Structure formats: C-alpha cells, structure tokens
mmCIF file with all atom_site columns, C-alpha atoms and ligand atoms in Angstrom:
data_model
loop_
_atom_site.group_PDB
_atom_site.id
_atom_site.type_symbol
_atom_site.label_atom_id
_atom_site.label_alt_id
_atom_site.label_comp_id
_atom_site.label_asym_id
_atom_site.label_entity_id
_atom_site.label_seq_id
_atom_site.pdbx_PDB_ins_code
_atom_site.Cartn_x
_atom_site.Cartn_y
_atom_site.Cartn_z
_atom_site.occupancy
_atom_site.B_iso_or_equiv
_atom_site.pdbx_formal_charge
_atom_site.auth_seq_id
_atom_site.auth_comp_id
_atom_site.auth_asym_id
_atom_site.auth_atom_id
_atom_site.pdbx_PDB_model_num
ATOM   1   C  CA  . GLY A 1 1   ? -10.236 -50.571 -37.237 1.00 0.00 ? 5   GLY A CA  1
ATOM   2   C  CA  . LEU A 1 2   ? -11.332 -53.814 -35.603 1.00 0.00 ? 6   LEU A CA  1
ATOM   3   C  CA  . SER A 1 3   ? -13.816 -56.440 -36.781 1.00 0.00 ? 7   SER A CA  1
ATOM   4   C  CA  . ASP A 1 4   ? -16.713 -57.420 -34.506 1.00 0.00 ? 8   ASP A CA  1
ATOM   5   C  CA  . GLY A 1 5   ? -14.927 -60.751 -33.914 1.00 0.00 ? 9   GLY A CA  1
ATOM   6   C  CA  . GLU A 1 6   ? -11.820 -58.837 -32.802 1.00 0.00 ? 10  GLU A CA  1
ATOM   7   C  CA  . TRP A 1 7   ? -13.859 -56.558 -30.511 1.00 0.00 ? 11  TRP A CA  1
ATOM   8   C  CA  . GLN A 1 8   ? -15.454 -59.682 -29.083 1.00 0.00 ? 12  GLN A CA  1
ATOM   9   C  CA  . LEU A 1 9   ? -12.017 -61.130 -28.202 1.00 0.00 ? 13  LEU A CA  1
ATOM   10  C  CA  . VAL A 1 10  ? -11.078 -57.847 -26.539 1.00 0.00 ? 14  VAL A CA  1
ATOM   11  C  CA  . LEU A 1 11  ? -14.250 -57.574 -24.479 1.00 0.00 ? 15  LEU A CA  1
ATOM   12  C  CA  . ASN A 1 12  ? -14.250 -61.213 -23.395 1.00 0.00 ? 16  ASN A CA  1
ATOM   13  C  CA  . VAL A 1 13  ? -10.667 -60.859 -22.128 1.00 0.00 ? 17  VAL A CA  1
ATOM   14  C  CA  . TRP A 1 14  ? -11.633 -57.612 -20.422 1.00 0.00 ? 18  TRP A CA  1
ATOM   15  C  CA  . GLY A 1 15  ? -14.364 -59.505 -18.529 1.00 0.00 ? 19  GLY A CA  1
ATOM   16  C  CA  . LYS A 1 16  ? -11.581 -61.577 -16.942 1.00 0.00 ? 20  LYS A CA  1
ATOM   17  C  CA  . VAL A 1 17  ? -9.760  -58.365 -15.993 1.00 0.00 ? 21  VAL A CA  1
ATOM   18  C  CA  . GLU A 1 18  ? -12.973 -57.116 -14.353 1.00 0.00 ? 22  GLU A CA  1
ATOM   19  C  CA  . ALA A 1 19  ? -12.853 -60.059 -11.920 1.00 0.00 ? 23  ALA A CA  1
ATOM   20  C  CA  . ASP A 1 20  ? -9.858  -58.388 -10.243 1.00 0.00 ? 24  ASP A CA  1
ATOM   21  C  CA  . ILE A 1 21  ? -9.464  -54.758 -11.379 1.00 0.00 ? 25  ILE A CA  1
ATOM   22  C  CA  . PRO A 1 22  ? -7.242  -53.620 -8.437  1.00 0.00 ? 26  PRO A CA  1
ATOM   23  C  CA  . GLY A 1 23  ? -4.869  -56.615 -8.775  1.00 0.00 ? 27  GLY A CA  1
ATOM   24  C  CA  . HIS A 1 24  ? -4.462  -56.084 -12.528 1.00 0.00 ? 28  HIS A CA  1
ATOM   25  C  CA  . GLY A 1 25  ? -4.170  -52.295 -12.144 1.00 0.00 ? 29  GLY A CA  1
ATOM   26  C  CA  . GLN A 1 26  ? -1.492  -52.490 -9.460  1.00 0.00 ? 30  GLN A CA  1
ATOM   27  C  CA  . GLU A 1 27  ? 0.660   -54.761 -11.629 1.00 0.00 ? 31  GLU A CA  1
ATOM   28  C  CA  . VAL A 1 28  ? 0.258   -52.489 -14.684 1.00 0.00 ? 32  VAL A CA  1
ATOM   29  C  CA  . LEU A 1 29  ? 1.550   -49.477 -12.725 1.00 0.00 ? 33  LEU A CA  1
ATOM   30  C  CA  . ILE A 1 30  ? 4.441   -51.452 -11.202 1.00 0.00 ? 34  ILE A CA  1
ATOM   31  C  CA  . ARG A 1 31  ? 5.616   -52.620 -14.639 1.00 0.00 ? 35  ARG A CA  1
ATOM   32  C  CA  . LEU A 1 32  ? 5.273   -49.079 -15.973 1.00 0.00 ? 36  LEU A CA  1
ATOM   33  C  CA  . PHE A 1 33  ? 7.192   -47.421 -13.122 1.00 0.00 ? 37  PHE A CA  1
ATOM   34  C  CA  . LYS A 1 34  ? 9.943   -50.057 -12.934 1.00 0.00 ? 38  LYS A CA  1
ATOM   35  C  CA  . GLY A 1 35  ? 10.356  -50.377 -16.702 1.00 0.00 ? 39  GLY A CA  1
ATOM   36  C  CA  . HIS A 1 36  ? 10.355  -46.619 -17.276 1.00 0.00 ? 40  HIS A CA  1
ATOM   37  C  CA  . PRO A 1 37  ? 11.260  -44.667 -14.083 1.00 0.00 ? 41  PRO A CA  1
ATOM   38  C  CA  . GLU A 1 38  ? 10.761  -41.340 -15.927 1.00 0.00 ? 42  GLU A CA  1
ATOM   39  C  CA  . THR A 1 39  ? 7.007   -42.086 -15.833 1.00 0.00 ? 43  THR A CA  1
ATOM   40  C  CA  . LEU A 1 40  ? 6.957   -42.211 -12.020 1.00 0.00 ? 44  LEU A CA  1
ATOM   41  C  CA  . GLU A 1 41  ? 8.133   -38.576 -12.022 1.00 0.00 ? 45  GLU A CA  1
ATOM   42  C  CA  . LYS A 1 42  ? 4.742   -37.515 -13.405 1.00 0.00 ? 46  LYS A CA  1
ATOM   43  C  CA  . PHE A 1 43  ? 3.101   -38.752 -10.167 1.00 0.00 ? 47  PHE A CA  1
ATOM   44  C  CA  . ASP A 1 44  ? 3.789   -36.530 -7.136  1.00 0.00 ? 48  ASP A CA  1
ATOM   45  C  CA  . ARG A 1 45  ? 1.306   -38.876 -5.439  1.00 0.00 ? 49  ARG A CA  1
ATOM   46  C  CA  . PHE A 1 46  ? 3.687   -41.864 -5.504  1.00 0.00 ? 50  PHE A CA  1
ATOM   47  C  CA  . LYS A 1 47  ? 6.968   -40.029 -4.818  1.00 0.00 ? 51  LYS A CA  1
ATOM   48  C  CA  . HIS A 1 48  ? 7.765   -41.971 -1.651  1.00 0.00 ? 52  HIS A CA  1
ATOM   49  C  CA  . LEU A 1 49  ? 7.620   -45.367 -3.400  1.00 0.00 ? 53  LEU A CA  1
ATOM   50  C  CA  . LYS A 1 50  ? 11.250  -46.224 -4.188  1.00 0.00 ? 54  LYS A CA  1
ATOM   51  C  CA  . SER A 1 51  ? 11.131  -49.976 -4.966  1.00 0.00 ? 55  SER A CA  1
ATOM   52  C  CA  . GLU A 1 52  ? 8.886   -52.669 -6.420  1.00 0.00 ? 56  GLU A CA  1
ATOM   53  C  CA  . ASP A 1 53  ? 8.357   -54.028 -2.879  1.00 0.00 ? 57  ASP A CA  1
ATOM   54  C  CA  . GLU A 1 54  ? 7.133   -50.649 -1.622  1.00 0.00 ? 58  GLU A CA  1
ATOM   55  C  CA  . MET A 1 55  ? 4.838   -50.301 -4.665  1.00 0.00 ? 59  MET A CA  1
ATOM   56  C  CA  . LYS A 1 56  ? 3.349   -53.737 -4.009  1.00 0.00 ? 60  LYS A CA  1
ATOM   57  C  CA  . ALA A 1 57  ? 2.547   -52.725 -0.400  1.00 0.00 ? 61  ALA A CA  1
ATOM   58  C  CA  . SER A 1 58  ? 0.881   -49.404 -1.302  1.00 0.00 ? 62  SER A CA  1
ATOM   59  C  CA  . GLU A 1 59  ? -2.929  -49.495 -1.109  1.00 0.00 ? 63  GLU A CA  1
ATOM   60  C  CA  . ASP A 1 60  ? -2.981  -46.058 -2.745  1.00 0.00 ? 64  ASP A CA  1
ATOM   61  C  CA  . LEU A 1 61  ? -1.091  -47.286 -5.811  1.00 0.00 ? 65  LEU A CA  1
ATOM   62  C  CA  . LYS A 1 62  ? -3.527  -50.191 -6.079  1.00 0.00 ? 66  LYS A CA  1
ATOM   63  C  CA  . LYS A 1 63  ? -6.440  -47.720 -5.838  1.00 0.00 ? 67  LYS A CA  1
ATOM   64  C  CA  . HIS A 1 64  ? -5.120  -45.606 -8.690  1.00 0.00 ? 68  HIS A CA  1
ATOM   65  C  CA  . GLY A 1 65  ? -4.414  -48.764 -10.713 1.00 0.00 ? 69  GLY A CA  1
ATOM   66  C  CA  . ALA A 1 66  ? -8.094  -49.629 -10.402 1.00 0.00 ? 70  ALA A CA  1
ATOM   67  C  CA  . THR A 1 67  ? -9.097  -46.098 -11.524 1.00 0.00 ? 71  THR A CA  1
ATOM   68  C  CA  . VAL A 1 68  ? -6.919  -46.384 -14.644 1.00 0.00 ? 72  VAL A CA  1
ATOM   69  C  CA  . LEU A 1 69  ? -8.310  -49.773 -15.718 1.00 0.00 ? 73  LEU A CA  1
ATOM   70  C  CA  . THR A 1 70  ? -11.919 -48.811 -14.929 1.00 0.00 ? 74  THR A CA  1
ATOM   71  C  CA  . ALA A 1 71  ? -11.564 -45.768 -17.236 1.00 0.00 ? 75  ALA A CA  1
ATOM   72  C  CA  . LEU A 1 72  ? -9.922  -47.895 -19.928 1.00 0.00 ? 76  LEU A CA  1
ATOM   73  C  CA  . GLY A 1 73  ? -12.721 -50.507 -19.643 1.00 0.00 ? 77  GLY A CA  1
ATOM   74  C  CA  . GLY A 1 74  ? -15.274 -47.739 -20.241 1.00 0.00 ? 78  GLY A CA  1
ATOM   75  C  CA  . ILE A 1 75  ? -13.456 -46.773 -23.433 1.00 0.00 ? 79  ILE A CA  1
ATOM   76  C  CA  . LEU A 1 76  ? -13.083 -50.354 -24.714 1.00 0.00 ? 80  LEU A CA  1
ATOM   77  C  CA  . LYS A 1 77  ? -16.780 -51.130 -24.238 1.00 0.00 ? 81  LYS A CA  1
ATOM   78  C  CA  . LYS A 1 78  ? -17.607 -48.350 -26.731 1.00 0.00 ? 82  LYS A CA  1
ATOM   79  C  CA  . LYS A 1 79  ? -15.630 -50.173 -29.448 1.00 0.00 ? 83  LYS A CA  1
ATOM   80  C  CA  . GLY A 1 80  ? -15.033 -47.883 -32.466 1.00 0.00 ? 84  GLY A CA  1
ATOM   81  C  CA  . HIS A 1 81  ? -17.247 -45.010 -31.229 1.00 0.00 ? 85  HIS A CA  1
ATOM   82  C  CA  . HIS A 1 82  ? -15.417 -43.772 -28.134 1.00 0.00 ? 86  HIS A CA  1
ATOM   83  C  CA  . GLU A 1 83  ? -14.858 -40.021 -28.667 1.00 0.00 ? 87  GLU A CA  1
ATOM   84  C  CA  . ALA A 1 84  ? -17.057 -38.994 -25.728 1.00 0.00 ? 88  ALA A CA  1
ATOM   85  C  CA  . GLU A 1 85  ? -14.962 -41.125 -23.340 1.00 0.00 ? 89  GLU A CA  1
ATOM   86  C  CA  . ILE A 1 86  ? -11.586 -40.115 -24.804 1.00 0.00 ? 90  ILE A CA  1
ATOM   87  C  CA  . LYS A 1 87  ? -12.185 -36.315 -24.936 1.00 0.00 ? 91  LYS A CA  1
ATOM   88  C  CA  . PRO A 1 88  ? -12.096 -35.520 -21.189 1.00 0.00 ? 92  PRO A CA  1
ATOM   89  C  CA  . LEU A 1 89  ? -9.178  -37.930 -20.637 1.00 0.00 ? 93  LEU A CA  1
ATOM   90  C  CA  . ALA A 1 90  ? -7.179  -36.331 -23.473 1.00 0.00 ? 94  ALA A CA  1
ATOM   91  C  CA  . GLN A 1 91  ? -7.997  -32.912 -21.981 1.00 0.00 ? 95  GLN A CA  1
ATOM   92  C  CA  . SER A 1 92  ? -6.751  -33.748 -18.474 1.00 0.00 ? 96  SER A CA  1
ATOM   93  C  CA  . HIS A 1 93  ? -3.728  -35.728 -19.659 1.00 0.00 ? 97  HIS A CA  1
ATOM   94  C  CA  . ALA A 1 94  ? -2.567  -33.088 -22.133 1.00 0.00 ? 98  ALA A CA  1
ATOM   95  C  CA  . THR A 1 95  ? -3.148  -29.902 -20.158 1.00 0.00 ? 99  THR A CA  1
ATOM   96  C  CA  . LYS A 1 96  ? -2.838  -30.898 -16.486 1.00 0.00 ? 100 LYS A CA  1
ATOM   97  C  CA  . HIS A 1 97  ? -0.794  -34.099 -16.219 1.00 0.00 ? 101 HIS A CA  1
ATOM   98  C  CA  . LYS A 1 98  ? 1.308   -33.309 -19.321 1.00 0.00 ? 102 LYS A CA  1
ATOM   99  C  CA  . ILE A 1 99  ? 1.535   -36.879 -20.577 1.00 0.00 ? 103 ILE A CA  1
ATOM   100 C  CA  . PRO A 1 100 ? 3.385   -37.463 -23.880 1.00 0.00 ? 104 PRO A CA  1
ATOM   101 C  CA  . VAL A 1 101 ? 1.933   -39.987 -26.348 1.00 0.00 ? 105 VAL A CA  1
ATOM   102 C  CA  . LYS A 1 102 ? 5.085   -42.122 -25.846 1.00 0.00 ? 106 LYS A CA  1
ATOM   103 C  CA  . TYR A 1 103 ? 4.015   -42.761 -22.237 1.00 0.00 ? 107 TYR A CA  1
ATOM   104 C  CA  . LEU A 1 104 ? 0.675   -44.083 -23.519 1.00 0.00 ? 108 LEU A CA  1
ATOM   105 C  CA  . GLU A 1 105 ? 2.694   -46.551 -25.609 1.00 0.00 ? 109 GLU A CA  1
ATOM   106 C  CA  . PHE A 1 106 ? 4.605   -47.570 -22.451 1.00 0.00 ? 110 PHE A CA  1
ATOM   107 C  CA  . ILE A 1 107 ? 1.435   -48.197 -20.446 1.00 0.00 ? 111 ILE A CA  1
ATOM   108 C  CA  . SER A 1 108 ? -0.057  -50.136 -23.391 1.00 0.00 ? 112 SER A CA  1
ATOM   109 C  CA  . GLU A 1 109 ? 2.949   -52.490 -23.330 1.00 0.00 ? 113 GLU A CA  1
ATOM   110 C  CA  . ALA A 1 110 ? 2.529   -52.892 -19.545 1.00 0.00 ? 114 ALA A CA  1
ATOM   111 C  CA  . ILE A 1 111 ? -1.145  -53.809 -20.030 1.00 0.00 ? 115 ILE A CA  1
ATOM   112 C  CA  . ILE A 1 112 ? -0.280  -56.453 -22.647 1.00 0.00 ? 116 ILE A CA  1
ATOM   113 C  CA  . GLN A 1 113 ? 2.402   -57.934 -20.374 1.00 0.00 ? 117 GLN A CA  1
ATOM   114 C  CA  . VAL A 1 114 ? 0.032   -58.135 -17.389 1.00 0.00 ? 118 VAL A CA  1
ATOM   115 C  CA  . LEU A 1 115 ? -2.632  -59.822 -19.510 1.00 0.00 ? 119 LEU A CA  1
ATOM   116 C  CA  . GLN A 1 116 ? -0.051  -62.352 -20.756 1.00 0.00 ? 120 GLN A CA  1
ATOM   117 C  CA  . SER A 1 117 ? 1.067   -63.041 -17.179 1.00 0.00 ? 121 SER A CA  1
ATOM   118 C  CA  . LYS A 1 118 ? -2.352  -63.376 -15.517 1.00 0.00 ? 122 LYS A CA  1
ATOM   119 C  CA  . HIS A 1 119 ? -4.128  -65.147 -18.381 1.00 0.00 ? 123 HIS A CA  1
ATOM   120 C  CA  . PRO A 1 120 ? -1.562  -67.370 -20.207 1.00 0.00 ? 124 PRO A CA  1
ATOM   121 C  CA  . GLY A 1 121 ? -4.150  -69.589 -21.943 1.00 0.00 ? 125 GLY A CA  1
ATOM   122 C  CA  . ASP A 1 122 ? -6.996  -67.152 -22.612 1.00 0.00 ? 126 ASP A CA  1
ATOM   123 C  CA  . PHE A 1 123 ? -4.700  -64.396 -23.875 1.00 0.00 ? 127 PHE A CA  1
ATOM   124 C  CA  . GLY A 1 124 ? -3.266  -66.175 -26.930 1.00 0.00 ? 128 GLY A CA  1
ATOM   125 C  CA  . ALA A 1 125 ? -1.923  -64.830 -30.226 1.00 0.00 ? 129 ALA A CA  1
ATOM   126 C  CA  . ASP A 1 126 ? -5.292  -63.870 -31.728 1.00 0.00 ? 130 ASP A CA  1
ATOM   127 C  CA  . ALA A 1 127 ? -6.545  -62.227 -28.510 1.00 0.00 ? 131 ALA A CA  1
ATOM   128 C  CA  . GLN A 1 128 ? -3.229  -60.385 -28.139 1.00 0.00 ? 132 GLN A CA  1
ATOM   129 C  CA  . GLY A 1 129 ? -3.428  -59.152 -31.758 1.00 0.00 ? 133 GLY A CA  1
ATOM   130 C  CA  . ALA A 1 130 ? -6.925  -57.791 -31.185 1.00 0.00 ? 134 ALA A CA  1
ATOM   131 C  CA  . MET A 1 131 ? -6.020  -56.146 -27.863 1.00 0.00 ? 135 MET A CA  1
ATOM   132 C  CA  . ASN A 1 132 ? -2.972  -54.551 -29.513 1.00 0.00 ? 136 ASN A CA  1
ATOM   133 C  CA  . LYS A 1 133 ? -5.207  -53.045 -32.215 1.00 0.00 ? 137 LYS A CA  1
ATOM   134 C  CA  . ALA A 1 134 ? -7.659  -51.782 -29.603 1.00 0.00 ? 138 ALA A CA  1
ATOM   135 C  CA  . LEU A 1 135 ? -4.899  -50.072 -27.606 1.00 0.00 ? 139 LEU A CA  1
ATOM   136 C  CA  . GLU A 1 136 ? -3.378  -48.641 -30.786 1.00 0.00 ? 140 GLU A CA  1
ATOM   137 C  CA  . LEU A 1 137 ? -6.770  -47.101 -31.634 1.00 0.00 ? 141 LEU A CA  1
ATOM   138 C  CA  . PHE A 1 138 ? -6.962  -45.664 -28.105 1.00 0.00 ? 142 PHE A CA  1
ATOM   139 C  CA  . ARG A 1 139 ? -3.483  -44.137 -28.517 1.00 0.00 ? 143 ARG A CA  1
ATOM   140 C  CA  . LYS A 1 140 ? -4.132  -42.755 -31.998 1.00 0.00 ? 144 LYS A CA  1
ATOM   141 C  CA  . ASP A 1 141 ? -7.376  -41.135 -30.872 1.00 0.00 ? 145 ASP A CA  1
ATOM   142 C  CA  . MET A 1 142 ? -5.746  -39.679 -27.753 1.00 0.00 ? 146 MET A CA  1
ATOM   143 C  CA  . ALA A 1 143 ? -2.993  -38.270 -30.010 1.00 0.00 ? 147 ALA A CA  1
ATOM   144 C  CA  . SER A 1 144 ? -5.557  -36.791 -32.438 1.00 0.00 ? 148 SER A CA  1
ATOM   145 C  CA  . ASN A 1 145 ? -7.449  -35.160 -29.567 1.00 0.00 ? 149 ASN A CA  1
ATOM   146 C  CA  . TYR A 1 146 ? -4.165  -33.720 -28.256 1.00 0.00 ? 150 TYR A CA  1
ATOM   147 C  CA  . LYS A 1 147 ? -3.837  -31.892 -31.606 1.00 0.00 ? 151 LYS A CA  1
ATOM   148 C  CA  . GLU A 1 148 ? -7.355  -30.433 -31.332 1.00 0.00 ? 152 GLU A CA  1
ATOM   149 C  CA  . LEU A 1 149 ? -6.445  -29.019 -27.918 1.00 0.00 ? 153 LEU A CA  1
HETATM 150 C  C1  . HEM B 2 .   ? -4.566  -46.379 -20.111 1.00 0.00 ? 213 HEM B C1  1
HETATM 151 C  C2  . HEM B 2 .   ? -4.209  -45.091 -20.114 1.00 0.00 ? 213 HEM B C2  1
HETATM 152 C  C3  . HEM B 2 .   ? -4.613  -44.167 -18.945 1.00 0.00 ? 213 HEM B C3  1
HETATM 153 C  C4  . HEM B 2 .   ? -5.832  -44.028 -18.409 1.00 0.00 ? 213 HEM B C4  1
HETATM 154 C  C5  . HEM B 2 .   ? -7.126  -44.765 -18.826 1.00 0.00 ? 213 HEM B C5  1
HETATM 155 C  C6  . HEM B 2 .   ? -5.740  -43.056 -17.335 1.00 0.00 ? 213 HEM B C6  1
HETATM 156 C  C7  . HEM B 2 .   ? -6.772  -42.628 -16.517 1.00 0.00 ? 213 HEM B C7  1
HETATM 157 C  C8  . HEM B 2 .   ? -6.698  -41.668 -15.537 1.00 0.00 ? 213 HEM B C8  1
HETATM 158 C  C9  . HEM B 2 .   ? -7.815  -41.158 -14.769 1.00 0.00 ? 213 HEM B C9  1
HETATM 159 C  C10 . HEM B 2 .   ? -9.281  -41.615 -14.946 1.00 0.00 ? 213 HEM B C10 1
HETATM 160 C  C11 . HEM B 2 .   ? -7.353  -40.236 -13.918 1.00 0.00 ? 213 HEM B C11 1
HETATM 161 C  C12 . HEM B 2 .   ? -8.192  -39.409 -12.908 1.00 0.00 ? 213 HEM B C12 1
HETATM 162 C  C13 . HEM B 2 .   ? -8.846  -38.221 -13.640 1.00 0.00 ? 213 HEM B C13 1
HETATM 163 C  C14 . HEM B 2 .   ? -7.814  -37.425 -14.409 1.00 0.00 ? 213 HEM B C14 1
HETATM 164 O  O1  . HEM B 2 .   ? -7.046  -36.678 -13.772 1.00 0.00 ? 213 HEM B O1  1
HETATM 165 O  O2  . HEM B 2 .   ? -7.753  -37.543 -15.663 1.00 0.00 ? 213 HEM B O2  1
HETATM 166 C  C15 . HEM B 2 .   ? -5.915  -40.138 -14.115 1.00 0.00 ? 213 HEM B C15 1
HETATM 167 C  C16 . HEM B 2 .   ? -5.056  -39.307 -13.430 1.00 0.00 ? 213 HEM B C16 1
HETATM 168 C  C17 . HEM B 2 .   ? -3.700  -39.192 -13.620 1.00 0.00 ? 213 HEM B C17 1
HETATM 169 N  N1  . HEM B 2 .   ? -2.975  -39.751 -14.668 1.00 0.00 ? 213 HEM B N1  1
HETATM 170 FE FE1 . HEM B 2 .   ? -3.713  -41.140 -16.017 1.00 0.00 ? 213 HEM B FE1 1
HETATM 171 N  N2  . HEM B 2 .   ? -4.438  -42.626 -17.257 1.00 0.00 ? 213 HEM B N2  1
HETATM 172 C  C18 . HEM B 2 .   ? -3.711  -43.279 -18.232 1.00 0.00 ? 213 HEM B C18 1
HETATM 173 C  C19 . HEM B 2 .   ? -2.369  -43.110 -18.479 1.00 0.00 ? 213 HEM B C19 1
HETATM 174 C  C20 . HEM B 2 .   ? -1.489  -42.317 -17.785 1.00 0.00 ? 213 HEM B C20 1
HETATM 175 C  C21 . HEM B 2 .   ? -0.032  -42.327 -17.888 1.00 0.00 ? 213 HEM B C21 1
HETATM 176 C  C22 . HEM B 2 .   ? 0.766   -43.245 -18.839 1.00 0.00 ? 213 HEM B C22 1
HETATM 177 C  C23 . HEM B 2 .   ? 0.453   -41.409 -17.033 1.00 0.00 ? 213 HEM B C23 1
HETATM 178 C  C24 . HEM B 2 .   ? 1.919   -40.992 -16.724 1.00 0.00 ? 213 HEM B C24 1
HETATM 179 C  C25 . HEM B 2 .   ? 2.990   -41.666 -17.157 1.00 0.00 ? 213 HEM B C25 1
HETATM 180 C  C26 . HEM B 2 .   ? -0.680  -40.801 -16.367 1.00 0.00 ? 213 HEM B C26 1
HETATM 181 C  C27 . HEM B 2 .   ? -0.617  -39.803 -15.423 1.00 0.00 ? 213 HEM B C27 1
HETATM 182 C  C28 . HEM B 2 .   ? -1.626  -39.415 -14.574 1.00 0.00 ? 213 HEM B C28 1
HETATM 183 C  C29 . HEM B 2 .   ? -1.430  -38.578 -13.406 1.00 0.00 ? 213 HEM B C29 1
HETATM 184 C  C30 . HEM B 2 .   ? -0.106  -37.976 -12.890 1.00 0.00 ? 213 HEM B C30 1
HETATM 185 C  C31 . HEM B 2 .   ? -2.802  -38.433 -12.771 1.00 0.00 ? 213 HEM B C31 1
HETATM 186 C  C32 . HEM B 2 .   ? -3.134  -37.659 -11.476 1.00 0.00 ? 213 HEM B C32 1
HETATM 187 C  C33 . HEM B 2 .   ? -2.946  -38.696 -10.362 1.00 0.00 ? 213 HEM B C33 1
HETATM 188 C  C34 . HEM B 2 .   ? -3.181  -38.113 -8.991  1.00 0.00 ? 213 HEM B C34 1
HETATM 189 O  O3  . HEM B 2 .   ? -2.346  -37.289 -8.549  1.00 0.00 ? 213 HEM B O3  1
HETATM 190 O  O4  . HEM B 2 .   ? -4.189  -38.483 -8.338  1.00 0.00 ? 213 HEM B O4  1
HETATM 191 N  N3  . HEM B 2 .   ? -1.840  -41.371 -16.848 1.00 0.00 ? 213 HEM B N3  1
HETATM 192 N  N4  . HEM B 2 .   ? -5.554  -41.014 -15.118 1.00 0.00 ? 213 HEM B N4  1
#
C-alpha cells in the first residue's frame, strides 16, 4: 500500500484540486473523451457533444466532472480503509453503467495529466508516484469488488 508520507502527499495535492473541483473535473472528462472516444459512448447524457470546444462550453459536463472528483476525493480521504466508499460505486459502475476496469485506467491517466498541467511545481515526481499508487489501489479495489458482484 502507501506510507503515511505518501498519503500525505496525495491529500495535500488533493487540497489544491478542491480549490477548483469543477475546473479540474471538466478537464479530466475532456481528456478522457478526446483520448478515448469509446468512453464517451457510455454517456447518453453527453451524446450531443461532438468536439473539445463543445465539451468546454457544456455546463452539464462540468457539473458531472465535479461529481466524479468529489466522489474520488471522498475515497482518497479514507486512505487504505475505503471499502465503504468503493462498494456502492463498484455496484453502480458494474451493473448499471457497465464500465470495464480498463476505462478506470484511462480516467486515472487523465487525472494524472490534469494534475501535471494545473500544478506543474507542486505535482512533482514524488507526488506523482504517490498519486499513481493511490489510483492503482482504487482500481484494484474496484476490480476486486466487481468480482464479488
Ligand atoms: C474516478 C473514477 C470514477 C468516479 C469516482 C465516478 C463517479 C461517479 C458517480 C458518483 C456517479 C453518480 C452515481 C452513480 O451512478 O454511480 C457516476 C455516474 C456515471 N458514471 Fe462514473 N465515475 C468514475 C469513472 C467512470 C468512467 C471511467 C466512466 C465511463 C467511461 C463512468 C461512467 C459513468 C456513467 C455513464 C454515469 C451516469 C451519468 C449520468 O447519466 O448522469 N464513470 N460516476
């Protein structure tokens, strides 16, 4: 897992994200949808958004971006003991939204990229290493919960 020092790096960086959740969330979704168009197909909600420029202008996309990062923040703040937060998310994402684990890898990469872009000093090698481990743990535990369902 992660050391307390590593968790501390993660949560300090996350505090910077919390300053502008909608801005960060919108950019994560844009990178996801543009980088991997197959992911946009899982969202009937955003079916009319056909370009990066349209995505950037959509208040609704920004709103959902905020929802995603708020939920992720809740999980991160529980450090290594996050089963209660992961369970319902695994349930909805497996059974209703039908989200493969690969797509969780894609959104993890998008998150890292956005953090690099918005926080070039603060999000250095050590912070990036720790955040990568934290997102890997999230993915592994989502995947494990998928199997229990
Ligand atoms: C960081 C990882 C993610 C988090 C924290 C997250 C969080 C959430 C939350 C809290 C909701 C609303 C409640 C629910 O239905 O579960 C939601 C809905 C949804 N999620 Fe995710 N999600 C993540 C990744 C993904 C990915 C990668 C996809 C698809 C590629 C996806 C597809 C969807 C869809 C289609 C909905 C319903 C949206 C709507 O029609 O309003 N999720 N997600």
